[PDB]
Amino acid sequence: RKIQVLQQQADDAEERAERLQREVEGERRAREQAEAEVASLNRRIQLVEEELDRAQERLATALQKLE
Amino acid sequence: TIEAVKRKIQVLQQQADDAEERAERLQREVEGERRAREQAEAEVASLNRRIQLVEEELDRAQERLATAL
């Protein structure tokens, strides 16, 4: 009957560890989602910077055609 | 029967100790993944501010182009 107190203690400890193991997997999923957004924004900023370079290069041809 | 109770108690206490040590390792594992997540989230916020900056530089370039024509 003292064993049932110890058996419950071991049950609770194993349960907290399993609860934390699922916490690891949930944090890893959220990490991968944020890192996937980082990749998407990296691709998006490169495209607008390319659009800007062309917009300034076009501006240069128009200004250069002015002198 | 006497030793079987002293041994059942020992095996149950070793089980809880191993589980408690596993929990400490997993707590650091959680933090390792969270640290990496919040690093990415900070870069997301930075990339959103930079994209808005480039879009403003773009609008200034397109506006002057329309004028320069």
Residue numbers in the entry:
A (entry chain B): 12 to 78
B (entry chain A): 6 to 74
Provide passages from the article that reported this PDB entry.
The stability of the Tpm polymer is dependent on the 4-helix overlap junction between adjacent dimers. The importance of this junction is highlighted by the fact that the greatest peptide divergence between Tpm isoforms lies in the N- and C-termini which generate the overlap junction.
To better understand the effects of ATM-3507 binding on Tpm3.1 function, structural studies were undertaken. While the Tpm3.1 C-terminal peptide and the overlap complex of the two peptides in the presence or absence of ATM-3507 did not crystallize, the crystal structure of the N-terminal peptide of Tpm3.1 was solved at a resolution of 2.3 Å. This peptide is analogous to the previously solved Tpm1.1 N-terminal peptide structure, and the structure is very similar to the Tpm1.1 coiled coil, with a root mean square deviation of 0.69 Å calculated with backbone atoms from residues 12-74 of the Tpm3.1 coiled coil. The structural similarity is perhaps surprising given that the Tpm3.1 N-terminus is coded by exon 1b, whereas the Tpm1.1 is coded by exon 1a which is shorter by 6 residues and only has 24% identity to Tpm3.1 at the N-terminus. The first 6 (including the Ala-Ser and the N-terminal residues not expressed in Tpm1.1) and last 3 residues (including the engineered Cys) are not visible in the electron density maps and are most likely disordered. Similarly, these N-terminal residues were not visible in the αTM1bZIP crystal structure, so these residues may be disordered in all Tpms containing exon 1b. Molecular dynamics simulations (MDS) were carried out on models of control Tpm3.1 N-/C-overlap junctions and also on this structure with ATM-3507 incorporated into its hydrophobic core. The N-terminal peptide showed a characteristic melting profile with no detectable difference in the presence or absence of ATM-3507.
